[PDB]
Design a protein around this ligand. Structure first.
Ligand SMILES: *[C@@H]1O[C@H](CO)[C@@H](O[C@@H]2O[C@H](CO)[C@@H](O)[C@H](O)[C@H]2NC(C)=O)[C@H](O)[C@H]1NC(C)=O
Ligand SMILES: *[C@@H]1O[C@H](CO)[C@@H](O[C@@H]2O[C@H](CO)[C@@H](O)[C@H](O)[C@H]2NC(C)=O)[C@H](O)[C@H]1NC(C)=O
Ligand SMILES: *[C@@H]1O[C@H](CO)[C@@H](O[C@@H]2O[C@H](CO)[C@@H](O)[C@H](O)[C@H]2NC(C)=O)[C@H](O)[C@H]1NC(C)=O
Ligand SMILES: *[C@@H]1O[C@H](CO)[C@@H](O[C@@H]2O[C@H](CO)[C@@H](O)[C@H](O)[C@H]2NC(C)=O)[C@H](O)[C@H]1NC(C)=O
Ligand SMILES: *[C@@H]1O[C@H](CO)[C@@H](O[C@@H]2O[C@H](CO)[C@@H](O)[C@H](O)[C@H]2NC(C)=O)[C@H](O)[C@H]1NC(C)=O
Ligand SMILES: *[C@@H]1O[C@H](CO)[C@@H](O[C@@H]2O[C@H](CO)[C@@H](O)[C@H](O)[C@H]2NC(C)=O)[C@H](O)[C@H]1NC(C)=O
Ligand SMILES: *[C@@H]1O[C@H](CO)[C@@H](O[C@@H]2O[C@H](CO)[C@@H](O)[C@H](O)[C@H]2NC(C)=O)[C@H](O)[C@H]1NC(C)=O
Ligand SMILES: *[C@@H]1O[C@H](CO)[C@@H](O[C@@H]2O[C@H](CO)[C@@H](O)[C@H](O)[C@H]2NC(C)=O)[C@H](O)[C@H]1NC(C)=O
Ligand SMILES: *[C@@H]1O[C@H](CO)[C@@H](O[C@@H]2O[C@H](CO)[C@@H](O)[C@H](O)[C@H]2NC(C)=O)[C@H](O)[C@H]1NC(C)=O
Ligand SMILES: *[C@@H]1O[C@H](CO)[C@@H](O[C@@H]2O[C@H](CO)[C@@H](O)[C@H](O)[C@H]2NC(C)=O)[C@H](O)[C@H]1NC(C)=O
Ligand code: VTX
Ligand code: VTX
Ligand code: VTX
Ligand code: VTX
Ligand code: VTX
Ligand code: NAG
Ligand code: NAG
Ligand code: NAG
Ligand code: NAG
Ligand code: NAG
Lengths: 211, 211, 211, 211, 211
């Protein structure tokens, strides 16, 4: 048997995707996320919505999906389908349409149990867009990523990179459109409405000025 | 075996999603629902439809999905996929398009058997919108949630919160659009057309005035 | 074991959805249908199409899905997923878009073997719409429901209610739009093009006049 | 056991849908197709596309799905789900959108092994539409059906009916639109680009003149 | 047992689609791709997007899906469903909508282990389109195909045909639209943002001038 097949069997034959992948239920599943703005397709002042094509990546730890490499031909990482493992329900609020995003089949996994998921997002979000300064307008729209259902005691959200490095990330931006990206400011806040439930969310402010 | 995996097996290995989860078929499955209006994307007088982005949550009791925590490391609640359990067919009438709503994967479950389902709704509804008072227009559109198929003797609908607390809920409203939300008035009515079938539905009147 | 679970097992453990549910293949599967027009969202003279939101219900007999109640705690009816049983391919011709219709999960079943399926239809149909009498225009569009593949010797279509009761059914119509519903006239005809195949279809004429 | 269930088991318990249904791999799977134009919803000169609602039927021989009727209560034909058998990938080129077409569940099968599949097509195709003779314009758009992947040595395409009978088929046309159908001319051609691969396709020219 | 069924069983009974199909994990899975532009449906300067209907084909080697023909009636190639085998996540960046593309069921396979996948692409891409030379405008938009997740050490991308033959391929172009295709220039580049990850992508520049 080839090493990859042996490892895949050893991992997925005694694993089920329903449960949150933690040995002890008393510990939360920390998720680190990152956002890169690839393009700004449309900014609609009439409908107060804008479309952003952003490259989204996140990683978390599956305490069940870990192995010792020397028993599997020193395999340090491998790829398996995303639908064969637990995936956090980290969803962006303020959304109005996300169906344009294709579902990526595979996710990378490392022998420590770390899972890396890279996916694109074609999300259109609803936010306030004023046209007061039309000729030299500057807009401030926000993306907030949250564990839709799980509370902070189950899922917590953190940054993959340092805040300043992602705040000034124009490395892959399509810098030839009507809008110019000034920054992507992150922000962490604990959101709570009921008297006992706290949810963790991460707000990304996309700052853009017309040209 | 970790506690979460043991509990998930104990629950789902002797459970099937087809049946209504009640020990005695003679008792109805009471469902408590709540509605929060997150935004009002569009109000179309031409087509007599308006779009509402509302946060919808509901809970019910699965008499099969219950356990004693002290046998499972004092696990009081856990999350499992929504497609692995019975889910009421509580659907909003007056709808014209609901495909924009993403399907949430997970639902919370408590050791009493209570199931909590949080999901977003991007529903567009058809209702009468008059433009008689255009400059200072005030509209009155309704959302009615009902068990589409099940009668009252199988599924009944109630309120999660007290009516007055939800009638004046503007806690998460996007209060920067063309429309302002004055209230969300609930109302319970038994709907019957045939001589023997009674269905339970809950009408939510979204009252909005232009600005 | 609770009665519902016992009945569900007894029914679905020795049943498969591929075959037409009849003890003798020589007899057709009679399907009784009913149509209620809930609203008329749009009437497009330019594209010669109109949209109708109609509440559709049908019932048929599954000779396999029958039981004696006294052996199952006097259970006279129960609900199971629609995708777990055979469902007739009764489709409306003249259609141009039906994707807006959500798939209802459950269907009611009675101990006689009768299956009841309630579903909504957001169908848009192509029909001739003349604008000759625009100010006082009256239109006559038709919906024809047929077993798309099965011939009359396999599937036959009948009316749930008497023709006159459904011809004057405005009980749930949204009577506040641009169009007023005058009647829904049914009609049964045997449709045949090849020299040996006869198909049963039921035409519903929706008569509407502008206002 | 009823005859239908016995036959369905006998057929599908020793059958798998992946392979091409032929006893000898050296022989091609001949597919006979037919096209009937039910309506011409739209002809867009701006985008150079037109929409045709056509009734499509095809049949082929499954050498595995055959039986002797006298062993199954003289059952000469039966219906089973289309997703439970092999189906040719006969796809129409020149297409721009086909998602509007619903997937038909069932297909008829005869004891000889013949499979009959009736399905509707809401395809919109891209073809050259000149507006030179606008007031009395006559257009000539084509539909070409081909085995997308399989070569002629695996799948071949033929006509169900004689060419002249289908060339003058206006039997179910919606003859009340802006366009009138003059004929549907078939044509068979072997398409080859690589030095060794030949693919069989059937071109249907829909001839229409404005009115 | 017929040869095709024997081969399909021998192949797929000891094979799983999760893993990358290589005997040794230390070697990358080289993928050869080709692009043919069938039509240019729309070029939108307003939204800075253009739609291209391109015929896409690719092939790779599955080291598990190989056999010796003389043991299977000299079967040199056969077709099996695409969802039953591993398929590279080679996705086109710069995309804005790909849902229009239908999923092809089957893929060809040869006894060496080579897998051939032919599929159509209805992708709309976002690229800079200037209207400076409107009457005689010439545009330069790019398609870049990459292994979305897998690095170069896992998936590498190459050309099926020689660059010059594909650079001057107008063999199936719909040469009757508003735009004329001057060439499809390929280009290979190793894309890297993190300090250790290198991804292989292939850029195809579609050069078009108005007429
Ligand atoms: C959830 O994650 C956030 C972000 O990682 C945590 O917030 C940080 O916590 C550390 C340590 O307590 C502080 O030094 C930082 O100042 C906090 N803020 C940020 C922006 O990093 C939070 O404590 C975590 N909560 C739980 C329950 O895990
Ligand atoms: C866009 O909005 C964000 C959030 O309100 C602004 O970020 C804050 O700016 C204030 C300015 O005094 C700072 O004190 C805060 O520390 C900032 N918060 C974060 C999380 O960075 C941002 O400045 C706004 N941009 C524009 C152009 O108005
Ligand atoms: C279905 O639920 C509704 C709402 O919970 C019930 O209506 C209430 O019933 C209680 C007790 O009979 C009354 O005190 C309330 O006045 C009723 N109305 C409201 C708005 O709460 C109804 O009785 C239930 N029916 C069944 C069959 O369970
Ligand atoms: C919107 O419509 C609802 C339902 O008709 C109104 O709610 C009712 O208002 C009347 C006013 O006399 C009260 O007597 C009822 O008790 C109310 N019913 C409920 C369930 O609250 C509402 O007032 C309307 N709003 C506007 C602005 O017209
Ligand atoms: C298919 O069903 C239709 C409608 O139920 C049948 O047509 C009726 O048949 C009865 C009895 O023969 C007549 O009294 C009615 O006048 C017919 N028309 C209507 C509108 O009810 C038809 O006979 C059935 N055919 C088969 C083969 O079952
Ligand atoms: C709409 O069309 C239907 C079908 O042509 C009409 O129904 C027929 O009307 C004629 C009038 O003489 C009657 O003789 C038939 O018996 C009717 N058939 C059925 C099945 O009811 C209907 O009258 C038309 N409505 C309008 C307003 O023109
Ligand atoms: C594929 O099918 C086509 C159409 O049935 C075949 O073309 C016909 O072949 C017959 C017999 O050789 C000729 O008499 C006809 O003139 C051909 N054309 C038409 C339009 O019928 C073709 O030979 C078949 N090829 C294979 C390899 O099966
Ligand atoms: C539409 O195009 C088709 C294909 O070019 C035409 O069909 C051909 O017409 C020529 C006319 O001389 C004949 O010689 C060919 O035999 C025809 N081929 C087939 C397969 O029938 C058709 O005439 C065109 N129609 C119009 C109105 O221009
Ligand atoms: C990935 O594939 C590319 C293209 O096949 C390789 O690039 C070529 O490599 C060969 C041999 O090293 C050179 O002769 C060519 O000049 C390279 N460029 C092109 C355009 O062919 C690349 O080496 C491969 N890398 C890996 C790690 O497999
Ligand atoms: C479209 O853009 C491509 C990429 O920039 C151009 O291709 C390059 O053209 C330059 C011209 O000096 C050559 O030196 C490069 O070798 C070309 N690269 C490749 C990969 O072919 C192309 O010329 C542009 N076309 C137009 C009409 O502007
Ligand atoms: C009173 C109240 C309680 C809870 C909430 S929150 C919420 C409500 C319904 C559906 C989903 C949610 N969310 C939970 C955490 N993740 C984001 C969405 C509100 C608004 C009011
Ligand atoms: C005469 C008559 C009988 C019953 C109804 S109800 C209905 C009808 C068809 C399809 C669905 C329903 N519903 C059932 C309960 N849940 C809401 C929808 C009518 C209108 C007339
Ligand atoms: C000559 C001829 C034969 C049969 C038909 S019918 C048809 C044709 C193709 C696809 C579907 C159908 N249908 C069968 C019964 N159910 C409605 C659709 C025609 C038009 C011509
Ligand atoms: C050089 C060349 C070779 C083959 C073709 S064909 C093709 C190409 C890519 C994807 C699909 C196809 N097809 C195969 C047969 N069925 C229709 C589509 C071309 C154009 C050029
Ligand atoms: C700092 C940085 C690191 C990596 C990338 S890449 C990327 C990021 C998120 C999601 C997907 C990707 N991709 C990986 C390779 N395949 C194409 C997409 C960037 C932009 C910045
Ligand atoms: C795995 O790595 C260890 C440490 O580098 C080495 O000793 C061993 O030989 C390696 N085994 C294989 C199969 O490469
Ligand atoms: C569970 O809770 C009970 C009551 O608080 C306690 O006595 C027991 O030690 C707990 N067990 C674990 C494993 O935490
Ligand atoms: C079922 O109904 C019969 C007849 O009414 C009655 O005699 C019997 O006691 C019932 N059984 C149960 C369990 O309700
Ligand atoms: C089947 O058909 C044959 C020939 O017509 C006949 O002899 C036989 O009795 C039939 N069997 C049944 C069960 O109808
Ligand atoms: C397979 O091919 C070999 C070599 O051409 C030949 O000797 C053998 O007879 C063939 N077998 C069959 C079954 O065709």
């Amino acid at each position: 048997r080839p090493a990859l097949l042996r490892l895949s069997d050893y991992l997925l034959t005694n694993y089920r995707k329903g449960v949150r992948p933690v040995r002890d239920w008393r510990k939360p599943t920390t998720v680190s996320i990152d956002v890169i703005v690839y393009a700004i397709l449309n900014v609609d002042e009439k409908n107060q919505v804008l479309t952003t094509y952003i490259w989204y990546r996140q990683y978390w730890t599956d305490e069940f999906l870990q192995w010792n490499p020397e028993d599997f031909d020193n395999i340090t990482k491998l790829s398996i389908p995303t639908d064969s493992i637990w995936v956090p329900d980290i969803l962006i609020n303020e959304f109005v349409d996300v169906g344009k995003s294709p579902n990526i089949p595979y996710v990378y996994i490392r022998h420590q149990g770390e899972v890396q998921n890279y996916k694109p997002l074609q999300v259109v979000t609803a936010c306030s867009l004023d046209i007061y300064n039309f000729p030299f307008d500057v807009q401030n729209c926000s993306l907030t990523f949250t564990s839709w259902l799980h509370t902070i005691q189950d899922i917590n959200i953190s940054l993959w990179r340092l805040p300043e490095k992602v705040k000034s990330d124009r490395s892959v931006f399509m810098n030839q459109g009507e809008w110019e990206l000034l920054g992507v400011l992150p922000y962490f806040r604990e959101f709570s409405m009921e008297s006992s439930n706290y949810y963790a969310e991460m707000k990304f402010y996309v700052v853009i000025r017309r040209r």
